Structures are given as C-alpha cells and as structure tokens.
Amino acid sequence: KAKELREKSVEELNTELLNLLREQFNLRMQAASGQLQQSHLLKQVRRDVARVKTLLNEKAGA
Amino acid sequence: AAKIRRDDEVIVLTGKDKGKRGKVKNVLSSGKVIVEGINLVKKHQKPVPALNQPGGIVEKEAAIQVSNVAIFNAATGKADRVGFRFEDGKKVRFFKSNSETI
Amino acid sequence: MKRTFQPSVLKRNRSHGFRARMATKNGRQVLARRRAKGRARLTVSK
Amino acid sequence: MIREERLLKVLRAPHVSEKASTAMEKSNTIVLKVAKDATKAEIKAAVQKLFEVEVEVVNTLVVKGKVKRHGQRIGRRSDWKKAYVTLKEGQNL
Amino acid sequence: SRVCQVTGKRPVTGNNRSHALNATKRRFLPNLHSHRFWVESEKRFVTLRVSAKGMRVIDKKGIDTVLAELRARGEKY
RNA sequence: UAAGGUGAUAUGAACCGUUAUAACCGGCGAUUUCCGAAUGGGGAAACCCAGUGUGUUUCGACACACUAUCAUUAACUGAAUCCAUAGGUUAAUGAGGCGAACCGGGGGAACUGAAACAUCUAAGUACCCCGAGGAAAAGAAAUCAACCGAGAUUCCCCCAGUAGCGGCGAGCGAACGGGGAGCAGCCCAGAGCCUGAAUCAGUGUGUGUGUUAGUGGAAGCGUCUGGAAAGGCGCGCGAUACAGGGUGACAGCCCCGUACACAAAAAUGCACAUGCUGUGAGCUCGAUGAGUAGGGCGGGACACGUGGUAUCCUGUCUGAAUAUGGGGGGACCAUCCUCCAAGGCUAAAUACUCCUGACUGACCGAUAGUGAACCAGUACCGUGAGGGAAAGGCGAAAAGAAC
RNA sequence: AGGACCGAACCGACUAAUGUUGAAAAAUUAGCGGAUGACUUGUGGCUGGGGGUGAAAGGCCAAUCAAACCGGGAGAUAGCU
RNA sequence: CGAAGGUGUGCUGUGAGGCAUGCUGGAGGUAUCAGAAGUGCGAAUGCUGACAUAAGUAACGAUAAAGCGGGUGAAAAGCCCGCUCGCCGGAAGACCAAGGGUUCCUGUCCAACGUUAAUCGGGGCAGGGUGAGUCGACCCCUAAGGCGAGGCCGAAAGGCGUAGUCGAUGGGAAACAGGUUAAUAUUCCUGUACUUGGUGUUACUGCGAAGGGGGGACGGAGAAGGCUAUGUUGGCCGGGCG
RNA sequence: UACGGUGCUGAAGCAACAAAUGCCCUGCUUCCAGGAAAAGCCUCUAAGCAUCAGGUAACAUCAAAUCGUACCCCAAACCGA
Ligand SMILES: [Mg+2]
Ligand SMILES: [Mg+2]
Ligand SMILES: [Mg+2]
Ligand SMILES: [Mg+2]
Ligand SMILES: [Mg+2]
Ligand SMILES: [Mg+2]
Ligand SMILES: [Mg+2]
Ligand SMILES: [Mg+2]
Ligand SMILES: [Mg+2]
Ligand SMILES: [Mg+2]
Ligand SMILES: [Mg+2]
Ligand SMILES: [Mg+2]
Ligand SMILES: [Mg+2]
Ligand SMILES: [Mg+2]
Ligand SMILES: [Mg+2]
Ligand SMILES: [Mg+2]
Ligand SMILES: [Mg+2]
Ligand SMILES: [Mg+2]
Ligand SMILES: [Mg+2]
Ligand SMILES: [Mg+2]
Ligand SMILES: [Mg+2]
Ligand SMILES: [Mg+2]
Ligand SMILES: [Mg+2]
Ligand SMILES: [Mg+2]
Ligand SMILES: [Mg+2]
Ligand SMILES: [Mg+2]
Ligand SMILES: [Mg+2]
Ligand SMILES: [Mg+2]
Ligand SMILES: [Mg+2]
Ligand SMILES: [Mg+2]
Ligand SMILES: [Mg+2]
Ligand SMILES: [Mg+2]
Ligand SMILES: [Mg+2]
Ligand SMILES: [Mg+2]
Ligand SMILES: [Mg+2]
Ligand SMILES: [Mg+2]
Ligand SMILES: [Mg+2]
Ligand SMILES: [Mg+2]
Ligand SMILES: [Mg+2]
Ligand SMILES: [Mg+2]
Ligand SMILES: [Mg+2]
Ligand SMILES: [Mg+2]
Ligand SMILES: [Mg+2]
Ligand SMILES: [Mg+2]
Ligand SMILES: [Mg+2]
Ligand SMILES: [Mg+2]
Ligand SMILES: [Mg+2]
Ligand SMILES: [Mg+2]
Ligand SMILES: [Mg+2]
Ligand SMILES: [Mg+2]
Ligand SMILES: [Mg+2]
Ligand SMILES: [Mg+2]
Ligand SMILES: [Mg+2]
Ligand SMILES: [Mg+2]
C-alpha cells in the first residue's frame, strides 16, 4: 500500500495512523469478545500501521 | 522453474497407478503432488462431535512424488519431459519431443 | 537438625549475584567461563 | 495518558469471569485486561476516551502467569495486568 | 609504584643464591627518593620520586631538559 | 524469482496471490523495548530514582533530547600568594567492554626425574597479568669470518645428539658453514641551492575483476519378477554432464543436479588507470645518538651451572674515548681483519582458526563419534566456583486402525 | 543486690534404654544441666586456606580438616597390587 | 527367485574356524590375492545398561482410636454427609516474617505420584482467583560494613582511603469498625475518618542554607501506684420446664 | 429456599468485682559495666531577594504513582534426597 501513501503528507498520514490504530483497538475488542470471525484483519491492520510509520520516518527530513 | 504445475494433466510413471492420467490438484512443499483419482487411500476417519462429525471410511487422494509423474503430451499420447526456454520475453515450458510449448 | 543451607535471597544475591560477579575481575571471568560453556543460567539471579 | 496513540494500546480485552460479572452488576465495575505498563491514570483516560463513559476510580493488580506443562516441557504464561474500573454510573458496551 | 619518573627503574626480579646455590626468588628495588628539584626555568620547586641515578641524570641533563622528556611521556609531575 | 503461499512441533482457522507489490532469495535502508562496558545517580542484572533544556496541554500532566569516568587539546575562569600555579566549569576529539588460537612483554610453580636429595631437572613449562595485530615479534651489521670472503631479519632441511655444559650425575645441547623458501631497503639527529620531480597514506572518479541473489542445462522405451523396478531380459539414446543426492528394491537418459554456457538494479572487496589534498626527493657541504660504552658489587640471559669464561641484559655504586676515536674476533696481550653501539621505520617467506564456503577421508556410526545425532551445557547435583547425564530408527506413503 | 536459689519457655547435652539397611548420615523416650547472664536469639555484616577463627578439643571454616572446596599442572609418580 | 544380522540343522577341517541349508529377517553383502588395523575378553572389589537372588521375606514412618448409618460409585476400613468416640488446646489453635511460588478456589480425570484401596488429594488437565493515598515494599534517613571521583600506595592484577555514595536488622506522614466472594480484603461495598503535597483565592507578612542550636536520642535491674485487654458473677432480655 | 441458603424485621444490650508479662512507663527509683547515628521535625540567622519572590492561616481544587497482597509457614508447601 506504500505507493499511494507516498502521495499523502505528514498530516494525512498521522491521522491515517490514528484511524488505523483505532481500527486496531476495535478489532482487538471484537477479537477477545468472541466476535470477529475474520481473524486475518489483525495482521492486516497491524502491517498498515507499520507501513504508515515507515513512511513518516521517511518524511521526517532524513 | 517448476516442471509440474497445479492444473497440468500428467501420467503416472511408477506405482499402482502406472499408466493412469490425472490432473494435478496441489503441489506440496515436499516435492509431492496430489493428482485427481490416482493414489487413492482408504482412510478410517474418526468422528468428531463438532464439525464434519460422521465417522467414515473415506477414499481420498494421497500424495505421490513429483518424480513419479510426467506431463501427458496429448498429441503424442505419451509421457514426456519438460524444458524451459524464453520465447518473446517470457520463460515458457516446452515438450522435449516436438519442441512445442505447453 | 539445622542443615547447612538456610536460604536468604539477599544473602544469595549479594554473595553470588550478577553484580557481585561483575564487581571483581575474577567474577567477570566466572561469567566469561559460564558464557563460553553456554550456561542457560549465568548467575544465581532470578 | 494524554496522547491518543498511547490510550489505544492500554486496554487489551475485557475479562469475562463470574467475579467480573458480579462487579458489573453490583459494584458498577468493569474488569479489563490492560497492558503491564499501563498505569491507573492511563487506564482511566483510556476508558473515558474510548468507551465514552465516566470513570470514578481504577484499581489494579498484576496476575502472575502460570507454569504449565506441554508433555515434558515446562512453560510459563505471561503475566498480565488486571484493572477494575469503577464507573460513576453508566455502562453501554 | 616503586618506579623512577626519570629513568623508569622498577623493581626487577632475580634469585638469592646461597653457598649451596639454593635459589630463591627475590626483588631488586631501586634507590628511590622523593626529592624537591629547583626549576629555575619556572621559579618553582617540583617534587619527583627519583632514583639516585635519575638524580645523577638530572644533574647532567638538567631538570629542565628532563621534565621536557617527562611531559613528552605523560608522567604528570 | 514466482504459482503457489501465511517458520516448527502441528494439525485447524481466517486469508493473501496465480503474468506481477502473494510468498520466497539477495543488496541498500527503516524500526530496533529492558538488562548488560551500560555511560544521568543508585542497585539484590533485566529494577528504583532523578536533574537540566526545549516543545506540548483542557492545566490532570505529556513527548523528545541531553546529563558517566578517564585521557588529550582548547576556551572561559580561578586559591593560599602580587605574578603565577594548583584547582573549577564547559566544548570537541578519542578510549572503556567482549572475543577461540596464534604473537609480544611483565611475573612464575610444583609434582616429577636424578632410581633418596638440596646443585641440576621438570621449565621460563603450567598458571596469573598487560598490550597489540592481521599476523605479531624481529630486522638493514658496533654481525660473522679467517687474511679467502660473506653481506639485514624470519621460517625449513642439514651441520649434530656433534663441539661443549653437567652433583662431568640425571640430563641439557649449540654454532661456524652449506642447501632452500622469500628478499627491499629507508629516515631523523641540519644547512644551502634547487622546490614541490620519488614515495606509501587517505580520499574521489573511470575501466576491468571477483563476492553478496540467480538463468538455461543432454538423452529411454518394451517386457519378466514384484506391493512397488531404478533390478533381470531385450532393443535404443546422450555424454566437455557416469560428481553426487533423491525417487515404493540398485536410474547416465523420472527428479534435483553435474560439465558447459550465461547473468546484477544496489552495495562492496582486491587490483589498475586517473584527479583534489597533504608527506618530501635530487644536488652540495656539514653532522654521526653519554650518565652511554666500559668497570666494581649482586643477579639474570647466552647450549655454556663462574668455571680459565668471552659476549648480551641490569638492581646498586661508578664512569670514558668520541674517527688522530671506539666495539668485536670466547680468559688475557700484541698484531691483522672486520664492523661503527648508545635514535628510529620497514613488505614477503612464518604462526594460528572463534567463524564462513567448497571438497576429501583404508575416520566414528548411537556404551562409538563432540558432553550433546534427540529442545544439551539441558535435566539433575551443588551456597558457590563448578560438576554434568540418559535419551536416535513404524511405514514407500499415515494409508496412524472407521465400525 | 547477685556470673544468687528452685523452676517453665529458651539454650544446652551427664546417664540409661531404644534404634544402628534407623522415623533420623547423631535422633527418640524417660530422666539431667544452665535458666538476668562470661546468657540466649533474629536480621545483616567482617575475617579465606599454611590462611582464618579458636574460654585451646588440632576444635570449627556449608554432613568434607594435622591444611577446605572447585578447576587446572595431570595420563603427577607408583622398583607395589 | 530374499543381502547382512538372528535361530536351528546337517556336513567338514588337527585347531582357531569353514561350507551348505530350513525358519525368521526385508536390503545390502562380497570371492580371490594383496594392504591397513580402535582385531578376538571370563576375571581387572573393571565400566555402562539389563536382569536375577535373598522374597512375595522385612517393612508401609510416632501405641491420639476408632465405630456405625446413609450417600456417591465398577468397586468405599480410608472420599462426602451425619451421629457417637477419642487426641491437641502457651497447641497438634490462629495471624505473619523468612523461605517457597500457584501448592489457593471450582470443575474434571485416576495411568503414574500417594509406602494399601481411592470415587479422595499439596497428583494430572482446564478454568478461575491477589483489587490500597493510610498495610508493606519503593521512598527520606542513617549503623555496622561495602563501593569509592580525585588522591595515597603497589611488578601487573590491584590494595587502602577522602569527598561522596550505598547499605536495615534501626529512625521517619496518615484508617477504623461493620458487610460481602467458591477463593481477596485495615485493598471491594456501607458508614465514619485521618495525613502529606501541589495548584489557586483571600487576609496578613520578613522570608531565606551544604551552615549554627535544640529535638529526635536510646542501658541494666527493681519497685509501687493507677488503668485497660480479658474474665467471673449478678441484673436485664429471650427461650426452656426436661 | 435449586438445601448450598436468601430478603424484611428485631429483644436486652447494664452494673459490680477480679485482673495482666500488655498500657501510663522513651516514666520513677537505684546500680555501674555508664548505655547508636542521621534525617524528618522545631528554631536561628548568612550570602541573598523585598510595594516581587517566599512565609503563616483559612478556604476551594487536584494529586498521592509504582511493585507486593493468592496459599503454606513449628510445616505434607521452608531447611532436611
Ligand atoms: Mg554470604
Ligand atoms: Mg543508567
Ligand atoms: Mg551506573
Ligand atoms: Mg624439586
Ligand atoms: Mg627423585
Ligand atoms: Mg634448578
Ligand atoms: Mg637451534
Ligand atoms: Mg535452473
Ligand atoms: Mg536436465
Ligand atoms: Mg521417481
Ligand atoms: Mg655483572
Ligand atoms: Mg661490549
Ligand atoms: Mg675486505
Ligand atoms: Mg654511532
Ligand atoms: Mg555418545
Ligand atoms: Mg543398537
Ligand atoms: Mg563429559
Ligand atoms: Mg555421553
Ligand atoms: Mg543463677
Ligand atoms: Mg543453679
Ligand atoms: Mg524454639
Ligand atoms: Mg523430641
Ligand atoms: Mg531429653
Ligand atoms: Mg534452675
Ligand atoms: Mg592432642
Ligand atoms: Mg562440617
Ligand atoms: Mg586453567
Ligand atoms: Mg593416574
Ligand atoms: Mg607434568
Ligand atoms: Mg557392513
Ligand atoms: Mg539367513
Ligand atoms: Mg562380557
Ligand atoms: Mg583370564
Ligand atoms: Mg527369610
Ligand atoms: Mg517374619
Ligand atoms: Mg511384618
Ligand atoms: Mg502411618
Ligand atoms: Mg460408612
Ligand atoms: Mg500444580
Ligand atoms: Mg486444596
Ligand atoms: Mg496406589
Ligand atoms: Mg481401580
Ligand atoms: Mg491439584
Ligand atoms: Mg575502598
Ligand atoms: Mg581512582
Ligand atoms: Mg542513602
Ligand atoms: Mg483466605
Ligand atoms: Mg496555599
Ligand atoms: Mg474492663
Ligand atoms: Mg428429667
Ligand atoms: Mg513483657
Ligand atoms: Mg491479601
Ligand atoms: Mg493472606
Ligand atoms: Mg502449627
């Protein structure tokens, strides 16, 4: 997913992080609560977070 | 660079089903392939109370070594061996006999 | 009868612990010896 | 506590024991599995931010993980932190 | 340590030999003395732990030349 | 590179992907908790507690950064004490600890052997300690030789168990000289004319070379036995490939491979070319390492135990000559020869293998071989240092025995 | 008042029996001594091997002591079995 | 179309051994002549593993002691419930530190573990369970002692030690009843409280230390007196009329 | 009331005596062997800051983190195989 995220900016990436992080939290809630058939979304969302932070460190100025 | 693919028609070279022709179903990590209706084992499937519960003797396909099968040519009507060559800009498999691309 | 081992974790930690060994040159070598022999439990700690 | 990124990592899961259902019914107290490095202030701000419910007080304890056997192998489960979160009055979820 | 700052004379080891030539390990220590040396180049007394030979070496070379060899060797004096 | 994939025990679940952002492999990158040299202070290792400075805030509190010691240099400052100096604060640079062997150095045993034992031996061994490097040390004659000459150091084979040393016991044990491996010579102790002309050092670039992923890679059927064929029989084919490993029993031709041929976006090594920056040759004339050589005393080292004992080192006390001069040639003298100490640098031939890759073995094949073929430095023992096991094999395929 | 008296806790260990592959690698049972002192006890700390400590028995220094334990020299040496 | 190995049989050689062969075994073995050795075991109080023997013997761990009924269960001397009995009671009760580390509670299982049986268990498996401003640690403070910038000493290692810094077994702020869970509670709930800080507002104001002083701050024995904890009786209330 | 217990109400709830090794007592008395330290705490000022900061009191408001807390603990859970 990194190719399109590169077009986005630091803001518009920090917010995408929080939204991803919230989605992470709700999935974590749904998972423990017996719900969430689709167990695969946890790795799916965990890796998008990793993807947005790698780009932020790539846009800090380095 | 694999010679036997997932949905290729093969013929068995060594075994109870020497001479039989099947279609490959799975290419396992082990260098073994499952071929439709070939290495039929008659299992003794235990019952489970939860999911797919009926205990039963199932006749499923077992896995044979990829070494023990060959792609069927279907033009010659015989087994054959695979080679790899580059056509227009892509790696393609060809029948050793007749040099035709699969 | 009173036996020889009378556990104290502080006495154990001070007499043979990791900091006690890294304190002296010869304790640094005890660990170097245990590190080379591949001991799972380098010292009495924990 | 204040950073939103930190609050979204602090609450792990709700605990679904009988003592916790009692705590909900009687004492207005939800029992949560939280991060081992979660402090009482972080859990309060997290619940108040995430579940949108008022929090009176947070009690906490660290559960020691259990030694188990898997055939011959010993193994230990990871310590986890339990949080009793007393609400003012109002539960939704 | 029993070392001269001028010469670098340190204790050296050896043997005590008896008439029967029984050998026993022993040390030869220098003739070390703390002596205040007048540095007229600086109008100051400088105190050095020195061998009697280093004392002879200072007389010959001059403490001024000597100390220049010491601060060219570390050897805080 | 790819049609298959989400490491293992280990199935299952929920999914990704199939002509190119699935996975896998390689390169450069990113993240990289806490402890540990551990370095902000402490501490019973993986924990406790700060300080400063910024930037944030709903004013509850947040996030990040810096803050060790020592050495060096610098700046500011700064006593007794006028100057100053010690001392103080800060900055910058560097070190710190780990690691198998090899190396060099500082210290240094005893058992033992002598058929007892002390000299002697074991042995400068084991052990402790310091330091370094890819090797280290050593090194360009104050050396040998013998009146002929050699031409720095190191390693190998001889010389030779010789000459000698030796309670002349036990034992220790050379060199000269020869054959070889590999050779490389330089600089300071100062001036001037000539001036950046040799030389490696870094530090850029070009072109080749290799490494770190990988691509292609020959040719076989029929029949017999059999659970199964690769085996038997028969008739064929390839071979710069019959190395090997696999496959339902023994396969050149089923598979992976092998010979052979090719290949790199990116990074990098060793070689070359070339460019910036710094180091200086070449000439000419000068200069030629002093508490040193040597000596006395005590010790050590030289094969050499003080012996008739040269030579080297020096703890102590002394102490020259200085090219018209000195050192050595195994007491010592003379003569003759030979070299020129007291200041330094220096490749290769040599040593070793924690680790990596390939290959091999009249090496082992589960009481063997590593202690450990297996989740082993584990379990277990022990306060601790430390000690330290046992334990491999269904089957071709789980077809692992429905009922 | 008391290194005073009798006597429990507490500290010790004179006798006897039991047990001696024990319940226990030193105990049990009955009795016995001290029991405000040179007492006793907890926690922590210091002393290290020809060294310690010893109201002194060569006693004790992790069930090990006329020189601890572990590792190494080390396959010591063994005219003996 | 059955290798090694194993197990019998037959034949044979002066002997070590050899040949054949059945059965098992299910994949390797190897003539000949040479070559090399971890080359031949009954002993070494040999080493390791395995298995005997004594022997179904001793013993089943305090001579505090059991008995019955019912229950559950495949099965009950041992578990549950119950009724009696007996034992401890300055303990064999209760709460802790230390040390241990889930042994706690519930459900489930009985192979091994339990010196017997086991339905039971500190046993196996699974789940649950520990809640703090006031308890305690951390924290402030220091003792012995330890480390120890510089420093002094020392062949090296390193030793001693100043400033400092650690170091409790000591000093230092504050919470009580009652109620509650299968298992936590001075931690949860009820009621009633206390302490220390920070920040603000108000009124007033001499406040400020690494320093000075006080305090903290301390022995043994002994004695009387006053109190409480606690108990005994009486009264009161409730039940009782054996 | 699922036999394991639950929800409402609720009597009297007094006195006297006795009495600690506990409290007053970190006291008193006496003795010789003559009995920690440091901080918190209170207080005084120095440099120094003053119609500021800081101090006392009242009042409000906020905070008081973190770790331990199960269970055995004269014992079948520690030391003793
Ligand atoms: Mg100790
Ligand atoms: Mg730190
Ligand atoms: Mg530190
Ligand atoms: Mg000797
Ligand atoms: Mg002898
Ligand atoms: Mg000798
Ligand atoms: Mg030689
Ligand atoms: Mg290929
Ligand atoms: Mg091929
Ligand atoms: Mg095959
Ligand atoms: Mg001499
Ligand atoms: Mg000489
Ligand atoms: Mg000549
Ligand atoms: Mg000279
Ligand atoms: Mg082995
Ligand atoms: Mg075997
Ligand atoms: Mg071993
Ligand atoms: Mg072994
Ligand atoms: Mg008395
Ligand atoms: Mg008496
Ligand atoms: Mg007692
Ligand atoms: Mg008794
Ligand atoms: Mg008795
Ligand atoms: Mg008495
Ligand atoms: Mg005696
Ligand atoms: Mg003992
Ligand atoms: Mg050693
Ligand atoms: Mg021996
Ligand atoms: Mg030896
Ligand atoms: Mg064989
Ligand atoms: Mg056979
Ligand atoms: Mg035998
Ligand atoms: Mg014999
Ligand atoms: Mg009998
Ligand atoms: Mg009998
Ligand atoms: Mg009997
Ligand atoms: Mg019994
Ligand atoms: Mg009954
Ligand atoms: Mg358990
Ligand atoms: Mg229980
Ligand atoms: Mg049993
Ligand atoms: Mg049974
Ligand atoms: Mg249990
Ligand atoms: Mg010290
Ligand atoms: Mg120092
Ligand atoms: Mg402190
Ligand atoms: Mg309880
Ligand atoms: Mg105020
Ligand atoms: Mg009373
Ligand atoms: Mg009656
Ligand atoms: Mg009392
Ligand atoms: Mg508790
Ligand atoms: Mg408790
Ligand atoms: Mg008890």
- SSE topology string of chain A: HHH
> Roughly what fraction of the amino acids of chain A lie in strands?
under 5%
Please tally the β strands of chain E and state the result.
4
Q: Tell the overall outline of chain E.
A: elongated
Give me the CATH superfamily of chain E: Ribosomal protein L28/L24
Q: Numbering strands along the chain, what is their spatial order in the largest sheet of chain E?
A: 1-2
CATH class wording of chain E: Mainly Beta
Question: What small molecules accompany the polymer chains?
Answer: magnesium ion
Gyration radius over CA of chain E: 16 Å
Distance between the termini of chain A: 21 Å
Q: Would you write up a description of this structure?
A:
This is part of a larger assembly, with chains A (62 residues), B (102 residues), C (46 residues), D (93 residues) and E (77 residues). With 62 residues, chain A is mainly alpha-helical. Chain A is built from three helices and no strands. Chain A has helices spanning 2-5, 14-32, 40-57. Chain C is mostly helical and 46 residues long. Chain C has three helices and no strands. Chain D has a single domain (1-93), classed as Alpha-Beta Plaits. Helices cover 25% and strands 38% of the residues of chain D. Chain D has helices at 4-7, 18-25, 40-50, and strands spanning 11-14, 29-34, 55-63, 67-70, 73-76, 80-87. In chain D, 20% of the residues are buried. Chain D is built from three helices and six strands; from the N terminus they run H-E-H-E-H-E-E-E-E. Chain E is 23% helix and 36% strand. Chain E has helices spanning 52-61, 63-70, and strands at residues 12-17, 23-28, 32-39, 44-51. Chain E starts with 11 loop residues before the first strand and ends in a 7-residue tail after the last helix. Chains in contact: A-D. Residues 14, 65, 67-68 of chain B line the site of one magnesium ion (MG). Chain B binds four RNA strands through strand 4, strand 6 and strand 8. The PDB classes it as ribosome. The entry lists the keywords ribosome. The entry is titled "High resolution cryo-EM structure of E.coli 50S".
